Design a protein around this nucleic acid. Structure first.
Ligand SMILES: [Mg+2]
Ligand SMILES: [Mg+2]
Ligand SMILES: [Mg+2]
Ligand SMILES: [Mg+2]
Ligand SMILES: [Mg+2]
Ligand SMILES: [Mg+2]
Ligand SMILES: [Mg+2]
Ligand SMILES: [Mg+2]
Ligand SMILES: [Mg+2]
Ligand SMILES: [Mg+2]
Ligand SMILES: [Mg+2]
Ligand SMILES: [Mg+2]
Ligand SMILES: [Mg+2]
Ligand SMILES: [Mg+2]
Ligand SMILES: [Mg+2]
Ligand SMILES: [Mg+2]
Ligand SMILES: [Mg+2]
Ligand SMILES: [Mg+2]
Ligand SMILES: [Mg+2]
Ligand SMILES: [Mg+2]
Ligand SMILES: [Mg+2]
Ligand SMILES: [Mg+2]
Ligand SMILES: [Mg+2]
Ligand SMILES: [Mg+2]
Ligand SMILES: [Mg+2]
Ligand SMILES: [Mg+2]
Ligand SMILES: [Mg+2]
Ligand SMILES: [Mg+2]
Ligand SMILES: [Mg+2]
Ligand SMILES: [Mg+2]
Ligand SMILES: [Mg+2]
Ligand SMILES: [Mg+2]
Ligand SMILES: [Mg+2]
Ligand SMILES: [Mg+2]
Ligand SMILES: [Mg+2]
Ligand SMILES: [Mg+2]
Ligand SMILES: [Mg+2]
Ligand SMILES: [Mg+2]
Ligand SMILES: [Mg+2]
Ligand SMILES: [Mg+2]
Ligand SMILES: [Mg+2]
Ligand SMILES: [Mg+2]
Ligand SMILES: [Mg+2]
Ligand SMILES: [Mg+2]
Ligand SMILES: [Mg+2]
Ligand SMILES: [Mg+2]
Ligand SMILES: [Mg+2]
Ligand SMILES: [Mg+2]
Ligand SMILES: [Mg+2]
Ligand SMILES: [Mg+2]
Ligand SMILES: [Mg+2]
Ligand SMILES: [Mg+2]
Ligand SMILES: [Mg+2]
Ligand SMILES: [Mg+2]
Ligand SMILES: [Mg+2]
Ligand SMILES: [Mg+2]
Ligand SMILES: [Mg+2]
Ligand SMILES: [Mg+2]
Ligand SMILES: [Mg+2]
Ligand SMILES: [Mg+2]
Ligand SMILES: [Mg+2]
Ligand SMILES: [Mg+2]
Ligand SMILES: [Mg+2]
Ligand SMILES: [Mg+2]
Ligand SMILES: [Mg+2]
Ligand SMILES: [Mg+2]
Ligand SMILES: [Mg+2]
Ligand SMILES: [Mg+2]
Ligand SMILES: [Mg+2]
Ligand SMILES: [Mg+2]
Ligand SMILES: [Mg+2]
Ligand SMILES: [Mg+2]
Ligand SMILES: [Mg+2]
Ligand SMILES: [Mg+2]
Ligand SMILES: [Mg+2]
Ligand SMILES: [Mg+2]
Ligand SMILES: [Mg+2]
Ligand SMILES: [Mg+2]
Ligand SMILES: [Mg+2]
Ligand SMILES: [Mg+2]
Ligand SMILES: [Mg+2]
Ligand SMILES: [Mg+2]
Ligand SMILES: [Mg+2]
Ligand SMILES: [Mg+2]
Ligand SMILES: [Mg+2]
Ligand SMILES: [Mg+2]
Ligand SMILES: [Mg+2]
Ligand SMILES: [Mg+2]
Ligand SMILES: [Mg+2]
Ligand SMILES: [Mg+2]
Ligand SMILES: [Mg+2]
Ligand SMILES: [Mg+2]
Ligand SMILES: [Mg+2]
Ligand SMILES: [Mg+2]
Ligand SMILES: [Mg+2]
Ligand SMILES: [Mg+2]
Ligand SMILES: [Mg+2]
Ligand SMILES: [Mg+2]
Ligand SMILES: [Mg+2]
Ligand SMILES: [Mg+2]
Ligand SMILES: [Mg+2]
Ligand SMILES: [Mg+2]
Ligand SMILES: [Mg+2]
Ligand SMILES: [Mg+2]
Ligand SMILES: [Mg+2]
Ligand SMILES: [Mg+2]
Ligand SMILES: [Mg+2]
Ligand SMILES: [Mg+2]
Ligand SMILES: [Mg+2]
Ligand SMILES: [Mg+2]
Ligand SMILES: [Mg+2]
Ligand SMILES: [Mg+2]
Ligand SMILES: [Mg+2]
Ligand SMILES: [Mg+2]
Ligand SMILES: [Mg+2]
Ligand SMILES: [Mg+2]
Ligand SMILES: [Mg+2]
Ligand SMILES: [Mg+2]
Ligand SMILES: [Mg+2]
Ligand SMILES: [Mg+2]
Ligand SMILES: [Mg+2]
Ligand SMILES: [Mg+2]
Ligand SMILES: [Mg+2]
Ligand SMILES: [Mg+2]
Ligand SMILES: [Mg+2]
Ligand SMILES: [Mg+2]
Ligand SMILES: [Mg+2]
Ligand SMILES: [Mg+2]
Ligand SMILES: [Mg+2]
Ligand SMILES: [Mg+2]
Ligand SMILES: [Mg+2]
Ligand SMILES: [Mg+2]
Ligand SMILES: [Mg+2]
Ligand SMILES: [Mg+2]
Ligand SMILES: [Mg+2]
Ligand SMILES: [Mg+2]
Ligand SMILES: [Mg+2]
Ligand SMILES: [Mg+2]
Ligand SMILES: [Mg+2]
Ligand SMILES: [Mg+2]
Ligand SMILES: [Mg+2]
Ligand SMILES: [Mg+2]
Ligand SMILES: [Mg+2]
Ligand SMILES: [Mg+2]
Ligand SMILES: [Mg+2]
Ligand SMILES: [Mg+2]
Ligand SMILES: [Mg+2]
Ligand SMILES: [Mg+2]
Ligand SMILES: [Mg+2]
Ligand SMILES: [Mg+2]
Ligand SMILES: [Mg+2]
Ligand SMILES: [Mg+2]
Ligand SMILES: [Mg+2]
Ligand SMILES: [Mg+2]
Ligand SMILES: [Mg+2]
Ligand SMILES: [Mg+2]
Ligand SMILES: [Mg+2]
Ligand SMILES: [Mg+2]
Ligand SMILES: [Mg+2]
Ligand SMILES: [Mg+2]
Ligand SMILES: [Mg+2]
Ligand SMILES: [Mg+2]
Ligand SMILES: [Mg+2]
Ligand SMILES: [Mg+2]
Ligand SMILES: [Mg+2]
Ligand SMILES: [Mg+2]
Ligand SMILES: [Mg+2]
Ligand SMILES: [Mg+2]
Ligand SMILES: [Mg+2]
Ligand SMILES: [Mg+2]
Ligand SMILES: [Mg+2]
Ligand SMILES: [Mg+2]
Ligand SMILES: [Mg+2]
Ligand SMILES: [Mg+2]
Ligand SMILES: [Mg+2]
Ligand SMILES: [Mg+2]
Ligand SMILES: [Mg+2]
Ligand SMILES: [Mg+2]
Ligand SMILES: [Mg+2]
Ligand SMILES: [Mg+2]
Ligand SMILES: [Mg+2]
Ligand SMILES: [Mg+2]
Ligand SMILES: [Mg+2]
Ligand SMILES: [Mg+2]
Ligand SMILES: [Mg+2]
Ligand SMILES: [Mg+2]
Lengths: 124, 138
RNA sequence: UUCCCGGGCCUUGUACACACCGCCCGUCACGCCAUGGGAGCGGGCUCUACCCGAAGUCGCCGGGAGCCUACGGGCAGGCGCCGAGGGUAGGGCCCGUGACUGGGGCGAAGUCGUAACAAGGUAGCUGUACCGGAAGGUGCGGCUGGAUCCUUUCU
RNA sequence: GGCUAAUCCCCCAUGUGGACCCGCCCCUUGGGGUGUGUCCAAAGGGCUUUGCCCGCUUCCGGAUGGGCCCGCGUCCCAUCAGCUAGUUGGUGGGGUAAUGGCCCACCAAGGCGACGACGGGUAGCCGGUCUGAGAGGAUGGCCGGCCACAGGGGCACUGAGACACGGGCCCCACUCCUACGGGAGGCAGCAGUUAGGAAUCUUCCGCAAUGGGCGCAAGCCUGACGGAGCGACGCCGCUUGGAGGAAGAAGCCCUUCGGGGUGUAAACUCCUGAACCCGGGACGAAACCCCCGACGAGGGGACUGACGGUACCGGGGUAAUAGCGCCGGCCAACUCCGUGCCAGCAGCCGCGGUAAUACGGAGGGCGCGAGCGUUACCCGGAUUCACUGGGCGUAAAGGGCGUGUAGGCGGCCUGGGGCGUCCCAUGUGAAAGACCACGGCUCAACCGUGGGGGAGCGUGGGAUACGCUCAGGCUAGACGGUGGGAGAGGGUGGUGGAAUUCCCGGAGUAGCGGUGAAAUGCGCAGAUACCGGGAGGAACGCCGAUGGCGAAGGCAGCCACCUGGUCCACCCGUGACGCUGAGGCGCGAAAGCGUGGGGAGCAAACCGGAUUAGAUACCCGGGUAGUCCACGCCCUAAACGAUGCGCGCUAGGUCUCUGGGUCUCCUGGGGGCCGAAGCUAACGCGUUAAGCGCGCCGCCUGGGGAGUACGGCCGCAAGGC
């Protein structure tokens, strides 16, 4: 565009939409489970995934993925939402954090325990 | 009406040299004549002279080239590899004396118009004046 | 040498490339959140006309209608304008709820077709217009982003 | 209701002086001088009381602090386009320290807005900070500057100063006291509780230091502050040992069963000596005070710690925490086993359905290391909003076309000005930060001292090339004059022939039509075919082109009139009068709408005949709106060259339309095809640019959702923007 046109009008800065309304700007949010279900993955894969509907402290209600192997989560257990999505599941934007509140860290897991919230095994 | 006669001179020259013409006529004005004087002094052209064409005054710019070449494409190197406008009507540009550009690490020129007259970049720094930044040439 | 099957060479078109036993379109039924519409309803703000109006400054009265006086005046007191907010009547904004429905977008994959891509089997596209189970058909005009000088589906 | 003191209040006096009205002088907004007139001061206290000290009063000036005013700069939405009644100005007045619609009365009818008024949304602003090669983007925690608020809203009093966080009056909400009448409250001060939240500390020590308030002082206050406490929250420094030690123990890992790995790693040898114990032990701190001197200067000269017995020095002294992510590509690090579309991984690409270097452990490896990963957010990359630094023939993108308003842009020569522009000088750009240097804690982080830097703005001076401006020239742009031309350019009227249909007439039989075949249909009321006559509507064969004209849509018989654009020649006239053009306004195929006409042929809808698995379609027979005209709407399109307008520049060749010419050819202006240079992702483009440039307008920013929704505007509707 001509310069005169840039004075008259000028470039437009580009707004971006937040992939996570955990609202609040918050890095995590505490919520209570509602449904603890299994879910069918999107077309390219096959499995049984463990997700949970959650009512947040933000007055928001969303499904959240349960990572790790085993999970003790039940209907009324209270949990901490992480954020980050699961590419192959429709409509799940956030993750559960294991080891926090009622979410139990993955039992027996020896490899990367920072994620999955398990503590260090003792060896003698 | 030429909307920017200076740009038109620069271009006339560009197109000319690109088809390897020996000379070109550009419609004349003292300001163009000043620019040319700088090119000539600076080694870019063989120099220029005033002519009349159907009674109307022009300037023959005589063009300078490298020697003939080896292999495919014997066409000689250009002496003006690059010539471009900086200040144009509709966006005008002025450098202070500390904003004067070092053009192609100095193997090039920038022609400024100043209140001391039309000078090269070195010329202006040495003179110590800023001005309207016209051409960039290398 | 027209035709049936298999095949070779040049060329052309293509949205095919697990390569025409290819692609892909839509309907309806069916598995999903989101959207509007959403009558009204619950309430928040603000606007306008009118009415009520605390405090307090300011103006007036301050009277054999109070108090002080050196008689100049002072205070108490009364009245008035302004005025926080309140009420009445409608105008807009906004949030929550929500009868009610539009299609949407994939979604277990079924269904009936064959519209488009090869002259896709009636060249396609197109603004419009009527029509139709559905891709759609047809009228008028346009475009080339069209091939080469009876019908006959699908994988 | 009563008593009473004062540095509390009031009345005369003195007028240094000052205030005020009127005059005069200077100055120039209400600054200063002056004369008369009127009006205005004070407070006392302590000492060693014959002198000093603390105070008080009127004034002038200084200093510091603030009030008010102006230029400029300071986010998003135009689906917010009009806003405005004290609103805009005036006269007079009120109020204040002071200008002012700040307020009031009266007068005029103004003021603001696309240069974005009004509306809505978000938000304290800055020094700076993060990021970035930079330009830029993002942010404003702590520290410093300014503003604003102190439960919500209004208000004033006191005062140098407030419309006052720990002051007051009132209204509302909330909590508490209540003899039900009425009262009391206000941590966004330091700690602490409670709630909300992913989450954010001690109800500590001290006034020793610095600072602030009062006081002659001694001194008192000080949750400002100086410290300590808790939290790897951040930064910096430090430890978990050092040297020797097998051609290499065991265990675990792989194995080609030869052996390879963990690995000098461990053991062990020797050495230092974190923690810890013992002893000494701070600076931070010399003023205020005391003495000499005159309560000065000067000289001396003693008291004074929270931190803390802490930092540090000296002595002694033990081998004494390692974790976390990752190892398919991006990306540094690979192998067994286990699991078989499971269980699971996942930032994207994508792994897993029996050999998985991608899942899960193990061995080994890489990376960092008192940390390491994750999530959220910002800049980065991203030249993906392109100022630097992008695009629009087919990828997203040229507005359907024009006219022209604002605006942007502007040929050649001379001169005045000096607004932009440039230069110099000076002021300002606080400190902190940033950069440089030196230095202080053993180093650093941290701190001090110094230096340099700096956009911007103020003032003075200077330059005049360019931009601007004013004046004066010019003719190369533009327009004009004269003459000549081509044309389906537009509008109005008229007229011609062909064909269809229909009606009349003649003549003449048994069919015609139609299809791949057929049938519907028409025909004995005589059709088709053939001849003659009439009526009527619509469109113009050959000419006709790969042609012409028009801004586009678009425009074909012929004639006349009305009329627009355009090209060439002459070189005559004006003298830059130019280009582009947001908004506006007008035009705008077809279909569609309204009112009225008209109606041959064609023909959506529809009615039938076929075909087919069905046929709602293609094919056949009919047929209405419509197609035609007048007037008024509609405003779309593959409105296509999918290519905005203008100007200058850059090989040629060939065909052609149309002017001029010395008419083998040359020269203008159009239409095409090849092709220099060059451009292009390619295909292509290539003096009819998609090349090289300049000006201006329009538009684009992954696909679907969707040209949908909502809002507005237009429209009779359809529906359009
Ligand atoms: Mg000159
Ligand atoms: Mg010369
Ligand atoms: Mg530039
Ligand atoms: Mg064959
Ligand atoms: Mg052969
Ligand atoms: Mg072959
Ligand atoms: Mg094709
Ligand atoms: Mg091919
Ligand atoms: Mg295939
Ligand atoms: Mg289907
Ligand atoms: Mg149903
Ligand atoms: Mg009252
Ligand atoms: Mg009054
Ligand atoms: Mg009285
Ligand atoms: Mg009163
Ligand atoms: Mg009132
Ligand atoms: Mg009210
Ligand atoms: Mg719904
Ligand atoms: Mg088809
Ligand atoms: Mg079709
Ligand atoms: Mg077809
Ligand atoms: Mg057909
Ligand atoms: Mg039909
Ligand atoms: Mg059609
Ligand atoms: Mg057609
Ligand atoms: Mg086509
Ligand atoms: Mg069939
Ligand atoms: Mg099928
Ligand atoms: Mg009394
Ligand atoms: Mg009493
Ligand atoms: Mg007495
Ligand atoms: Mg007194
Ligand atoms: Mg007196
Ligand atoms: Mg006097
Ligand atoms: Mg005077
Ligand atoms: Mg006097
Ligand atoms: Mg007295
Ligand atoms: Mg003073
Ligand atoms: Mg001031
Ligand atoms: Mg902001
Ligand atoms: Mg809207
Ligand atoms: Mg008013
Ligand atoms: Mg008034
Ligand atoms: Mg008056
Ligand atoms: Mg006044
Ligand atoms: Mg006051
Ligand atoms: Mg303006
Ligand atoms: Mg902000
Ligand atoms: Mg705010
Ligand atoms: Mg920086
Ligand atoms: Mg930096
Ligand atoms: Mg910066
Ligand atoms: Mg900034
Ligand atoms: Mg900011
Ligand atoms: Mg702040
Ligand atoms: Mg601050
Ligand atoms: Mg200030
Ligand atoms: Mg307030
Ligand atoms: Mg509070
Ligand atoms: Mg409140
Ligand atoms: Mg308040
Ligand atoms: Mg006071
Ligand atoms: Mg108050
Ligand atoms: Mg206040
Ligand atoms: Mg308080
Ligand atoms: Mg009270
Ligand atoms: Mg808590
Ligand atoms: Mg809590
Ligand atoms: Mg602290
Ligand atoms: Mg204490
Ligand atoms: Mg102190
Ligand atoms: Mg002190
Ligand atoms: Mg004092
Ligand atoms: Mg004393
Ligand atoms: Mg106290
Ligand atoms: Mg402190
Ligand atoms: Mg911790
Ligand atoms: Mg932690
Ligand atoms: Mg060793
Ligand atoms: Mg071994
Ligand atoms: Mg071994
Ligand atoms: Mg030892
Ligand atoms: Mg000391
Ligand atoms: Mg000392
Ligand atoms: Mg001392
Ligand atoms: Mg003495
Ligand atoms: Mg002394
Ligand atoms: Mg001394
Ligand atoms: Mg002391
Ligand atoms: Mg101590
Ligand atoms: Mg020691
Ligand atoms: Mg020792
Ligand atoms: Mg050891
Ligand atoms: Mg690698
Ligand atoms: Mg993993
Ligand atoms: Mg196995
Ligand atoms: Mg295996
Ligand atoms: Mg496999
Ligand atoms: Mg593996
Ligand atoms: Mg991996
Ligand atoms: Mg693994
Ligand atoms: Mg390991
Ligand atoms: Mg460290
Ligand atoms: Mg971290
Ligand atoms: Mg980024
Ligand atoms: Mg950028
Ligand atoms: Mg960059
Ligand atoms: Mg992006
Ligand atoms: Mg750019
Ligand atoms: Mg820039
Ligand atoms: Mg681009
Ligand atoms: Mg396409
Ligand atoms: Mg396109
Ligand atoms: Mg166009
Ligand atoms: Mg278009
Ligand atoms: Mg103009
Ligand atoms: Mg010029
Ligand atoms: Mg100047
Ligand atoms: Mg001069
Ligand atoms: Mg300066
Ligand atoms: Mg500084
Ligand atoms: Mg500092
Ligand atoms: Mg520093
Ligand atoms: Mg240093
Ligand atoms: Mg040092
Ligand atoms: Mg420093
Ligand atoms: Mg410094
Ligand atoms: Mg400095
Ligand atoms: Mg100056
Ligand atoms: Mg100056
Ligand atoms: Mg001059
Ligand atoms: Mg001049
Ligand atoms: Mg000029
Ligand atoms: Mg101008
Ligand atoms: Mg002139
Ligand atoms: Mg002349
Ligand atoms: Mg002419
Ligand atoms: Mg003549
Ligand atoms: Mg003529
Ligand atoms: Mg015509
Ligand atoms: Mg006829
Ligand atoms: Mg007859
Ligand atoms: Mg019959
Ligand atoms: Mg008969
Ligand atoms: Mg009959
Ligand atoms: Mg007969
Ligand atoms: Mg006839
Ligand atoms: Mg008729
Ligand atoms: Mg006739
Ligand atoms: Mg023809
Ligand atoms: Mg034509
Ligand atoms: Mg004419
Ligand atoms: Mg002639
Ligand atoms: Mg002439
Ligand atoms: Mg003349
Ligand atoms: Mg124009
Ligand atoms: Mg326009
Ligand atoms: Mg139209
Ligand atoms: Mg029409
Ligand atoms: Mg009609
Ligand atoms: Mg009609
Ligand atoms: Mg027909
Ligand atoms: Mg038909
Ligand atoms: Mg039918
Ligand atoms: Mg009708
Ligand atoms: Mg109709
Ligand atoms: Mg019409
Ligand atoms: Mg363009
Ligand atoms: Mg024009
Ligand atoms: Mg040609
Ligand atoms: Mg001729
Ligand atoms: Mg030509
Ligand atoms: Mg033409
Ligand atoms: Mg070509
Ligand atoms: Mg080439
Ligand atoms: Mg280019
Ligand atoms: Mg051009
Ligand atoms: Mg291009
Ligand atoms: Mg999208
Ligand atoms: Mg879109
Ligand atoms: Mg549409
Ligand atoms: Mg609408
Ligand atoms: Mg309407
Ligand atoms: Mg509608
Ligand atoms: Mg439509
Ligand atoms: Mg409507």
């Amino acid at each position: 565009p001509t310069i005169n046109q840039l004075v008259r009008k000028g470039r437009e800065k580009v707004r971006k939409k937040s992939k996570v309304p955990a609202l609040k700007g918050a890095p995590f949010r505490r919520g209570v489970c509602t449904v603890v279900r299994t879910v069918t993955p999107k077309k390219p894969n096959s499995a049984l995934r463990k997700v949970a509907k959650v009512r947040l402290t933000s007055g928001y209600e969303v499904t959240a993925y349960i990572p790790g192997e085993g999970h003790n989560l039940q209907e009324h257990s209270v949990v901490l939402i992480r954020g980050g999505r699961v590419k192959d599941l429709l409509g799940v934007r956030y993750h559960i954090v294991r080891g926090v509140y009622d979410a139990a860290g993955v039992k027996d897991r020896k490899k990367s325990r920072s994620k999955y919230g398990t503590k260090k095994p003792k060896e003698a | 009406m030429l909307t920017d006669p200076i740009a038109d001179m620069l271009t006339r020259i560009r197109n000319a040299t690109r088809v390897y013409k020996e000379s070109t006529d550009v419609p004349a004005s003292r300001f163009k004549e000043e620019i040319l004087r700088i090119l000539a002094r600076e080694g870019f052209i063989k120099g220029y002279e005033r002519v009349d064409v159907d009674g109307k005054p022009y300037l023959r710019v005589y063009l300078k080239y490298g020697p003939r070449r080896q292999g495919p494409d014997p066409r000689p190197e250009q002496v003006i590899h690059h010539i471009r406008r900086i200040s144009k009507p509709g966006r005008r540009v002025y450098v202070g004396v500390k904003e004067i550009p070092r053009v192609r690490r100095g193997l090039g020129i920038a022609i400024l118009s100043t209140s001391k007259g039309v000078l090269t970049d070195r010329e202006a720094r040495k003179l110590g004046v800023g001005g309207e930044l016209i051409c960039e040439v290398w």
